[PDB]
Amino acid sequence: GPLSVFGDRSTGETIRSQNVMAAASIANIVKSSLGPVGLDKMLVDDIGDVTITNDGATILKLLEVEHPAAKVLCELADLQDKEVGDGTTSVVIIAAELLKNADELVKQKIHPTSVISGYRLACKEAVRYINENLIVNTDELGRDCLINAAKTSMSSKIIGINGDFFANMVVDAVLAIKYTDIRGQPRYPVNSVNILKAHGRSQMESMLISGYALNCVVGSQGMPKRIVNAKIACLDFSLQKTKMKLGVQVVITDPEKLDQIRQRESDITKERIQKILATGANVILTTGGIDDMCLKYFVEAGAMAVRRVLKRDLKRIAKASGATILSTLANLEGEETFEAAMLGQAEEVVQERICDDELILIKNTKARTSASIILRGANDFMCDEMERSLHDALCVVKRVLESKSVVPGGGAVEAALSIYLENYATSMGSREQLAIAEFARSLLVIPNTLAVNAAQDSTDLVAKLRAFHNEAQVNPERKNLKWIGLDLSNGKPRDNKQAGVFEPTIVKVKSLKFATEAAITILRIDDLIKLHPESKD
Amino acid sequence: HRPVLVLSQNTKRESGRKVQSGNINAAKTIADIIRTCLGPKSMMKMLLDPMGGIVMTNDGNAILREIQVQHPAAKSMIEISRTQDEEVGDGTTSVIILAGEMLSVAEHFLEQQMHPTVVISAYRKALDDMISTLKKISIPVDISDS
Amino acid sequence: APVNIFKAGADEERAETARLTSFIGAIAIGDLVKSTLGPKGMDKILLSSGRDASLMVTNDGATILKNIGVDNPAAKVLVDMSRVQDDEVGDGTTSVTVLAAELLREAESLIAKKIHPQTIIAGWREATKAAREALLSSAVDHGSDEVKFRQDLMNIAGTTLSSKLLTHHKDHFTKLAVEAVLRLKGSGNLEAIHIIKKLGGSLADSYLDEGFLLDKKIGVNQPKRIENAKILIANTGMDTDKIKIFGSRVRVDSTAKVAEIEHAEKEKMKEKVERILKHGINCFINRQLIYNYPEQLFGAAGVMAIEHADFAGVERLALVTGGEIASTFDHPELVKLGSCKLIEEVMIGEDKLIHFSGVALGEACTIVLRGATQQILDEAERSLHDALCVLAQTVKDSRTVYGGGCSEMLMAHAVTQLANRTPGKEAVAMESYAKALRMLPTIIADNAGYDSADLVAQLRAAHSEGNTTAGLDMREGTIGDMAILGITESFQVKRQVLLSAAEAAEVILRVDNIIKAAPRKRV
Amino acid sequence: TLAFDEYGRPFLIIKDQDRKSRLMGLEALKSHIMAAKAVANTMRTSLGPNGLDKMMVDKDGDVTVTNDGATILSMMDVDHQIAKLMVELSKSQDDEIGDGTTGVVVLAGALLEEAEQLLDRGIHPIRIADGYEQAARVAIEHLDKISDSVLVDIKDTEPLIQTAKTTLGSKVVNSCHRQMAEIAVNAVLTVADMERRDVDFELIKVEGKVGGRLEDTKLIKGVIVDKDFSHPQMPKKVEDAKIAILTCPFEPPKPKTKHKLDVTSVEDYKALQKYEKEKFEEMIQQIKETGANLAICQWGFDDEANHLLLQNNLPAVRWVGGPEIELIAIATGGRIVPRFSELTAEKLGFAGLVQEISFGTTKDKMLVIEQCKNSRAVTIFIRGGNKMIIEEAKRSLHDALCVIRNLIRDNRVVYGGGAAEISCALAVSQEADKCPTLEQYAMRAFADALEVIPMALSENSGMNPIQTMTEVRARQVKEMNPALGIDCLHKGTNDMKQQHVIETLIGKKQQISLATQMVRMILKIDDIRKPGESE
Amino acid sequence: TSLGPKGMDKMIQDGKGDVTITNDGATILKQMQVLHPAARMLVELSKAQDIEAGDGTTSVVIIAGSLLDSCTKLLQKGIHPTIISESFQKALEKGIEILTDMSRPVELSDRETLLNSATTSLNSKVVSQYSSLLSPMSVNAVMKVID
Ligand SMILES: Nc1ncnc2c1ncn2[C@@H]1O[C@H](COP(=O)(O)OP(=O)(O)O)[C@@H](O)[C@H]1O
Ligand SMILES: Nc1ncnc2c1ncn2[C@@H]1O[C@H](COP(=O)(O)OP(=O)(O)O)[C@@H](O)[C@H]1O
Ligand SMILES: Nc1ncnc2c1ncn2[C@@H]1O[C@H](COP(=O)(O)OP(=O)(O)O)[C@@H](O)[C@H]1O
Ligand SMILES: Nc1ncnc2c1ncn2[C@@H]1O[C@H](COP(=O)(O)OP(=O)(O)O)[C@@H](O)[C@H]1O
Ligand SMILES: Nc1ncnc2c1ncn2[C@@H]1O[C@H](COP(=O)(O)OP(=O)(O)O)[C@@H](O)[C@H]1O
Ligand SMILES: [Mg+2]
Ligand SMILES: [Mg+2]
Ligand SMILES: [Mg+2]
């Protein structure tokens, strides 16, 4: 008679109501961590680890989910870090409210393919309207655009101070790693900034190290820990005793030739260490291993040798100091040449005190003048929060300098799109106009969440918010009310042009493209079959 | 045996006033443990280790490291005394009492329908004025004198 | 109904295991009692698992099926079929069980031949009608010339007792069974022949008493034997009467009046016995119990007193002495008394029984069965009960047919003669009806150890051209004449074997669905 | 999600919702059809004269072989609420008419099978149910076209016998197809009130005793009770019985209240003996002064009163049931007397041969009343070879007693054997085109389901369903439609008027009416709220 | 409910934990893992449609699910199943001649004919809103590698 599957089958409006409650179970979590009045959470594990964070990606990655519609919204937050980097609480609330308003349409016996086709006409028109209603590029504002866009990202986190201490350190970090490319591409690789953590003084003592901050120790306590006018030798091979390979064995037939082979394992080893040290090299960085026999040659000659450094850290030092990453001997059948003209340069390599640990600093690197940020917090829970908040702040200034276009934040984009799409649904709307009209109400949840978390008036402040944006579209008298946002500290609509509340363009363009595409896949689960777990057979 | 159609299985959810006023009582509980170990008239506190040893001390850092707590906000206060132990020497017991008292007065304003970001923005303005006061009442020291 | 089953603990089957479980459960019943059919068939011993098992050996097919407790649903129809055969004619319960099982065994052969089961029912109804005319036209009546009817009654009892435990006792037990029904001289009540089983002695020591035997010996100080007595029985209360007024007390003012009431109670009990002895009697039988106060009154007057014989004990004494029950003693001129010669007490198996020797109008008998064990006495009682019930109906219906396989070949010949005058749709079902009728002399011939493949073939060749009285001779193992050897059975016994097996096989063959419900307290 | 909210709170609506079962879907209607078709496919093989019986086993182990559709569905352990409505459908046909209990379940399963293909085409289930009401109305009006009977209950019993042969032709009483059919005709007409057209089945006593054969079933005009003569020397045959029916026990009169009668002196105790001695002589003389020679008593007898019956030549029975003596006073024309003082010659019953008959070796000795005088109560004595053939004959002959009752309620007949179902299927197909606006597909599904009952007769008779039905249905359109059906041996031609296959009009009128309304209550349901396990 | 441009997709979550959304009839039946032996033959029917045609997978189950559903009344009319198998072949051989009369001979050089054929198969999937890009890319990926 029925289906003889050994799992479970649920059809109809059961799964159509379960996917909305699965998406609302995720959105109601992250609704309390949006905007400058948002608050952080606690993520406690079974082993006892506590993670205090408010970013939309760190919470949903550590949180376990079971529903298939819940894994779509959790993987939607992971894509926002790679594509944009701060846009990762706002996408989850929009994509869940896109399913909440579309559930009210399919309960009115409206076909979901008209809602899918109605959402594509509203998503492509939202990108078209936001690209024709921008204020200015990065020429008029200058450095004031980079600082004000950085403070908007920090307002939802622990580094949202009233001053410009953390804002100036981010702009000075991205501007110091300007790496040009072919065909006129000024790239800004923000992954080259080594963000370090140390439980020390307050947040106002966060050092901006112009150069690189290596997270390693010297090793042997007989080397000079401060070298002025240093020459960095970046190399990746273990400075240990000469061990033969698997194909080579030592089969001796004469007992007199025994001790000459035993001394040869250290003579070939020390032959490399004398030709890399006679060329003026004082700092040697190694990703392999330097044993206790080879540490004597640096104490005797007065050189610094750092062992077991990361491979991702050696590439950031050799590119910034002009050093060449050498793995072995080379240069056309040469015995030991080392190409001594390709040594790195540094002004000062100094191991400072980082509150009961050792940290090596390189000052200005003499070739590229890179930057590294050492964070200072109260405990380890604040340092993990300060690292995530700084990494999201580095991604904001990266997209502004690459794509010179900013949009007003604080719900100013979602207020203008809530009224333009209602007029867009009336012109060319015959049967898909109800999906475009619900696309505007789903976008209004971003200024609605700012009024809930601020404990302000909800149905009056957003009603006063769209009152200025309606007059900016139907009354062409140059009212300039396209930048009207929210003042959550006062509870009144303010102008985000003069207040300095700036967000990048692709933090809302890619947010509206990812949330609309995720809402289509969850809208097509009218039939769902769940099989039994095959564990013990 | 059919499985129950749930979401986020075997985890807890807690929000509202029970977390804001719940982390204050966890901070007041640790500050009452080492409250009798600040003045010169203090007393030792005999502790017992899982290895079988005995730690009889009155220092604020060595007491909190021997306490295994289950509350998440109580685990934050133990890492505060570990930070004060590595930076300075005798900066332990004073921070745990002071952070419990700054959160004691912070619980009063959370009942007055005030946002927690208003208290923190007032705490950061107060922190910048406490550093400037200690530098005015300081005194230079002759380090060459024995 | 198996697909998407809407039952809780009940199961069912339709046309696949329905006729499969019906044909397995019915043949295994008929193959069980197959070894007990005929004059040379063995017997069964029935036993339980414990808790007063009470082993009871029986050769009759009704007593075997009523105690086994078959769990098969279609097998209970053949169990209930043999129960009616024991209650109506008292014989042929084994013959009706094998015949109803051989019909369904031939119907199982028609499964692979793709014959419709309603065609087999319509083919067997015409076969049963042809078999009724074979027994009716071959029945031998007996009116006058009573010296041939008493010889015919000994052939009925000799045929019934030959298939039982009384094998080498036909010279005695035939006279004990014929003369018991011959002394009834009326209706076959089948309760005046009281069978008393006593241990000790052989079956040849058993006899038919000329009078009547009883228990509950004569009083304490009363005479044990009175010659030429007048027997008066009763069904009244003697002492502690509490006579029919519920809610009557003795409310007096002093204890001297209680002594006057209890003396007045014993005077009315004495006056009741004085009304009994005005008839001029010497023996007294009461169905109820006689206490000590009227027992002294009968002992002082020289009158016997038999107290609490049986509820049906006063009925047999009323038929063997020629009196009446007489529960009220107020008219001595309207109470008929019994008659006897000797009321001496005899001792049978170290037990003193009251022998009513020399009674007049003795329409009741007493068979004193004596056997080696209790298992023989329980078998010989049922063997005599299977012989007295046929003779009680042979005197009501004097039509007799020739048994010993002769009646079955006459019935099978009439079906085969009409099977050739029918079209091929129903002629195959009629040939299976005639083959099952020939199985009944085949079971009898093979139980002795004879060549059953040739003796039934000689019976079929004999009945095909004359020889209406030719049957199976189990004495020497050949074919002989049944009128010469004297092997006859009753017409109503052989009709109920044919008719009840044809009706019971009609019910089971028409079943295409066995829907059994969920039983209680079975997990 | 279920049992949890989006805010983390437990979401409990009803108690024990984890062990519940709820289906709305599109398979909730599909689960009702597949549960009802398996009941209709079971009852399809037991339809018609070639219908095979079913073996039913009770919970106690008792086995009853039944063929009527009322007792088959009633003795099941089906715990399915859709199939439980099919049990009450066959019970409602038995309580009202009592002939088509098998055909009303195959017809209801046929309407649901045709509605399964109509459900996949997008038709609403109430729109199919509203289309079946407009289609069953045509089948009622077309069934009243040819209907006539000439029953006068005097000498024209020939339409009454042939009507009962159609009901008894499908049962196991076909060996007594002419004998037992005449029993059920004369049993109704002697007890029915023709002035009110009302038949009371309490006057028709149906008794059964094992032994004999099916041909020994006789219609005893009178009563058959278990005779309990307290005296074994009582005469077992009364030629002319003046029956004295009484309801007082043969005893001194005991009151209904607490008495505690006081005895003081010995003159009061001697007065107790003379009170009871004259009471037993008064209760015996008051019967003999009326001229009675037979007594019936509901309660027991005393031992002192037993011998006074034999001295006065007055046979009497003991411990008769409640409604048993109610049948004696109607069959004999007497009156039931409460006391002994109210006995008279006018309250006596009249009967002829009053005797007891012993059956084989048993000790039952039932009463046989041969002669009577204008009795309004008869008793059918069913005999057989076993209890399986008797309890079925009690159910088979009860269906024959009901079809004669339906002829007195309505003297219009039809012709069975599938002839009325093919003729009614042509009436719905002719009115499906007048007009085919909305309910065209619902009426054609009704006409295709009415043809399942005659094609089930062709399947059980070994013929082909679609070959035989196409021949019979085409002959009713080419000419005027006769009584044209089918049979098992086919009796030569297929004319039901010549084969005398006669069924009642109101029997088939309630087959279409009850199956349509039961389909409407199982089509107008879109949810099931059954629980899970038992405990 | 997964057929046509107005059809919805199905999501099958297996016992391992790899839940995928699928609309093609071949991919649905291979993930359902039906235990009934007669229903597993319908899974292999949609598998060979994916091999031979590639675009006949959901429709081969609607036809075979209805041809057996039409045999429900045919088996209740005394018709032998060998007679139904002979008549289904006569309807199959006459069915190809009807579809051949509706066919129009086209040429692979016409890009507008190949574009409208690929756009029809994309209307039932999730990429029906992306048929302005995927359907031109499906034709150009084929007609440049076939010669
Ligand atoms: N000063 C401010 N005034 C008003 N709104 C603000 C201000 N600063 C930030 N916001 C709002 O807070 C929101 C924070 O979003 P966020 O959680 O950072 O997104 P994501 O999770 O993608 O990084 C932004 O959408 C922005 O509109
Ligand atoms: N003689 C004294 N008179 C008054 N106060 C004192 C005296 N000696 C110590 N104290 C106070 O006792 C406190 C002890 O602090 P302590 O617990 O040692 O801090 P930490 O835990 O950082 O070492 C100091 O803050 C100091 O002001
Ligand atoms: N002397 C004899 N010669 C031939 N056949 C005999 C003789 N005595 C008995 N039989 C056969 O043995 C069979 C015994 O049947 P039985 O078991 O008594 O049937 P049931 O159990 O119904 O009484 C009879 O059918 C009879 O034909
Ligand atoms: N001689 C016959 N020829 C053709 N059909 C017959 C004949 N006798 C009975 N039938 C059919 O057999 C069917 C038996 O129906 P039945 O099961 O008795 O209904 P119910 O269960 O309501 O009593 C009737 O509908 C009738 O048409
Ligand atoms: N634009 C359209 N208008 C109407 N019907 C369409 C359109 N596009 C596709 N269809 C229908 O959708 C159905 C999709 O069938 P499909 O599931 O692709 O079959 P298969 O599983 O064999 O590939 C086709 O039968 C087609 O008739
Ligand atoms: Mg015998
Ligand atoms: Mg009938
Ligand atoms: Mg397709």
Judged by CB atoms closer than 8 Å, whether chains meet at A12 and D1 is answered as no
* DSSP run (H or E) holding D532: none
**CA dist., res. D40 & res. E33, Å (int):** 32
Segments in C226-288 forming alpha helices (H): 256-276
How many pairs of residues across C and D have Cβ atoms under 8 Å apart? 235
From atom 11 of ligand 1, which residue's Cα is the shortest distance away?
A: A35
Residue A378 C-alpha to ligand 2 middle, in angstroms?
21
List, as one string, the DSSP characters of A388-415.
Answer: HHHHHHHHHHHHHHHS--EEETTTHHHH
Show the DSSP H helices in D12-102 as ranges. 28-43, 69-74, 81-96
Buried b (16+ CB within 10 A) or exposed e, C127-156: bbebbeebbeebbeebeeeeeeeeebbbbb
Contact D361 C499 (CB under 8 A): no
Parallel, antiparallel or unpaired: strands C470-473 and C231-234: unpaired
Interior/surface letters C376-403, b for 16+ CB within 10 angstroms, e for the rest: bbbbbbbbbbbbbbbbbbbbeebbbbbb
Strand partners, A406: A504
**Is the CB of C41 inside a 6 Å radius of any atom of ligand 3?**
no
Q: From ligand 8's centre to the CA of E59, what distance in Å?
A: 9
The yes-or-no reply on A/E contact (3 CB pairs or more, < 8 Å) is yes
Instruction: Provide the pairing of β-strand C352-355 with C345-347.
Output: antiparallel
Phi–psi pair at A329, nearest 5 degrees: -85, 150
Q: Which two tokens stand for residue C508?
A: 């089971």
Residue B93 in contact with ligand 2 by CB distance below 6 A: yes
Phi (first) and psi of residue A473, to 5 degrees? -115, -25
Asked if the Cβ–Cβ distance from E76 to D465 is below 8 Å, we say: yes
Task: Output the six-digit token pair for C15.
Answer: 């046309």
Residue A90 Cα to chain centre, angstroms: 15
- How crowded is the C-beta side of A454, counted as CA atoms within 13 Å? 23
Which residue, by CA, sits nearest to atom 13 of ligand 3?
A: C38
The token pair at D71 is 């007792």
Neighbouring-strand partners of residue C44 = C58
**What is the rounded distance in angstroms from the CA atom of residue A491 to the CA atom of residue A388?**
29
Burial of C162 (0-12, 13-18, 19+ CB in 10 A): middle
State the Cα–Cα distance between residues A345 and A282, nearest whole angstrom.
10
- Catalytic residue ranges of D: 68, 101-102, 399
Structure-derived torsion over alpha carbons of residues A501, A504, A509, A511, reported in degrees to the nearest 10: -70
A387: exposed, middle or buried (C-beta count within 10 Å: 0-12, 13-18, 19+)? middle
Cα separation of A402 and A383, whole Å? 29
Domain that holds residue C332: 212-365
Q: Which two tokens stand for residue E45?
A: 């029917």
CB contact under 8 A, A199 and B83: yes
SS3 call for D123: coil
Which ligand 1 atom is nearest residue A153's CA? 18
The residue segments making up the domain with residue D260 are 223-409
Which of A513, A517, A524 is the best residue to mutate to test the E interface, defined by the most E CB atoms within 10 Å of its own CB?
Answer: A524
User: By CA distance, what is A199's nearest residue in B?
Assistant: B83
Tokens of C472: 């199976």
Residue ranges of D for the binding site for ADP?
48, 100-102, 170, 417, 487, 503, 508
Answer whether B touches D (≥3 Cβ pairs < 8 Å).
yes
CA dist C467 and D39 (Å) reads 56
CA torsion sign for D334, D338, D340, D346 is negative
DSSP D241-301: EEEEEE-S-BSS---SS---EE--SHHHHHHHHHHHHHHHHHHHHHHHTTT--EEEESS-B
Ligand nearest to the CA of B62: 2
Q: Please, how many CA atoms are within 13 Å of residue A447, restricted to the half-sphere of its CB?
A: 33
Structure tokens at C213: 């035997």
The answer to whether the annotation marks B60 as part of a ligand binding site is no
Say yes or no: B4 contacts chain D, CB-CB below 8 A.
Answer: yes
Task: Say yes or no: CB of residue C383 within 6 Å of ligand 3.
Answer: no
Cα-based distances in Å from A245 to A237, A248, A263, E87: 15, 5, 18, 78
Q: Which residues of E touch D (CB under 8 A)?
A: 69, 76-79
The residue annotated as part of the active site, out of A53, A58, A81, A88, is: A88
How far is residue A154 from each of residues A77, A159, A399, A490, B123, measured CA to CA in Å? 18, 6, 16, 19, 17
Gap between the Cα atoms of B76 and B64, Å rounded: 11
Alpha carbon A31 to its chain centroid, in Å, reads: 21
Residue reference for tokens 């399809």: D44
Residue C472 Cβ contacting ligand 3 at under 6 Å = yes
Q: Which two tokens stand for residue D306?
A: 């037993």
- Would you give the DSSP letter of residue A357? S
Going by DSSP bridges, is the β-strand pair C400-402/C488-490 parallel, antiparallel, or unpaired?
antiparallel
Strand partners, D355: D237, D368
Write phi, then psi, for A373 (nearest 5 degrees).
Answer: -115, 125
Q: What is the DSSP letter of C139?
A: P
State residue C511 phi and psi, 5-degree precision. Answer: -90, 120
Among A390, A510, A406, residue whose Cα is nearest residue A76: A510
Going by the DSSP 8-state scheme, the letter that residue C141 receives in this structure is P
CA distances from D463 to A453, C372, E141 (A): 81, 66, 63
CA distance C395 to C181: 9
- Residue A55 designated active-site: yes
Q: Closest residue (by CA) to atom 13 of ligand 4?
A: D48
How far apart, in Å, are the Cα atoms of D197 and each of A95, C172, D188, D204, D205? Answer: 78, 68, 11, 16, 20
CA distance A442 to C441: 96
Helix (H) or strand (E) holding D61: none
Distances (CA, A) of D486 to C193, D143, D159, D297, D512: 59, 18, 20, 55, 20
> Is residue B22 annotated as involved in ligand binding?
no
Residue D93 φ/ψ, nearest 5 degrees:
-70, -35
- Please tell me the distance between residue D171's alpha carbon and the centre of ligand 4 in angstroms: 10
What is the DSSP code string of D153-165? SSS--HHHHHHHH
Is B81 a pocket residue for ligand 2 (Cβ < 6 Å)? Answer: no
Look-up of token digits 């010497």: C282
D256: phi > 0 → left, psi -120 to 50 → alpha, else beta; which? alpha
Q: Does A75 touch chain E (CB under 8 A)?
A: no
Instruction: Give the C-alpha separation, C369 to C209, whole Å.
Output: 11
Q: By CA distance, what is D230's nearest residue in C? A: C325
Partner C contacted by D30 (CB < 8 A)? no
Closest listed residue to residue D54, CA positions, set D64, D85, D62, C101: D64
Of the ligands numbered here, which is closest to the C-alpha atom of E6?
A: 5
C39 close to ligand 3 (CB < 6 Angstrom): yes
* Ligand number nearest to the C-alpha of E57: 5
Judging contacts by C-beta atoms under 8 Å, the chain D residues touching residue A24 are: 6
Asked if D449 and D116 count as a contact pair (C-beta separation under 8 A), the reply is no
Displacement of CA B81 from its chain's centroid (Å): 7
Q: What residue ranges in D124-260 does DSSP mark as E strands?
A: 204-210, 218-220, 237-238, 241-246
Q: CATH number of the domain at C298, please.
A: 3.50.7.10
* CB of B94 sitting under 6 A from ligand 2: yes
Q: Which of E6, E12, E128 sits opposite A111 (nearest CB)?
A: E6
What's the CA angle centered on D466, arms D464 and D471, to 5 degrees?
95
Specify the amino acid at residue A291. Answer: D
Is the alpha carbon torsion for C271, C277, C283, C286 positive or negative?
A: negative
Token duo for residue C234: 């009763």
Q: What is the DSSP letter of D52?
A: P
Identify the helix (H) or strand (E) that includes residue C412: helix C406-419
Residues making up the annotated binding site of E for Mg(2+) are 55
The binding site of E comprises 4, 55-59, 123-125
Residue pairs spanning A and B at CB distance below 8 A: 67
CA distance D48 to chain A (A): 29
Examine the residue annotation and report whether A88 is marked as an active-site residue of this protein. Answer: yes
Note the ligand closest to the C-alpha atom of D67.
Answer: 4
- CA A358, A363, A364, A366: dihedral to nearest 10 degrees? -110
Which ranges of C464-516 would DSSP assign to H, the alpha helix? Answer: 482-485, 491-509
Which residues pair with residue A211 across a beta bridge? A363
Q: What share of chain A is helix, strand, coil (3-state, %, to 5)?
A: 45, 15, 40
Largest Cα span, chain C: 100
D507 lines ligand 4 (CB under 6 A): no
Kindly state the helix (H) or strand (E) to which residue A64 belongs, with its residue range: none
Residues linked to residue A198 through DSSP beta bridges, in sequence order: A376
A contacts of E36 (beta carbons < 8 Å): 4
Ligand 6 centroid to residue C106 C-alpha, Å: 25
Residues whose CB falls within 8 Å of the CB of residue E58, separated by 6 or more in sequence, listed in order = E2, E3, E23, E24, E25, E28, E46
Q: Which helix (H) or strand (E) covers residue A447, if one does? A: helix A445-453
Q: Return d(Cα A194, Cα A210) in angstroms, integer.
A: 11
- From the list C161, C92, C84, the residue with the least C-alpha distance to C379 is C161
- C476, two tokens: 């020497």
Method used to obtain the model? cryo-EM
- Token pair in block for residue A450: 């700012």
From the candidates A269, A392, A505, A516, give the one annotated as an active-site residue: A392
Please, where are the H alpha helices in C110-203?
A: 117-137, 146-160, 173-182
Using CA atoms, how far apart are residues C347 and C361, in angstroms rounded to an integer? 25
Q: Is the minimum CB–CB distance between D8 and chain B shorter than 8 Å?
A: yes
Contacts of C430 (CB under 8 A, 6+ apart): C123, C124, C126, C127, C415, C416, C418, C419, C422
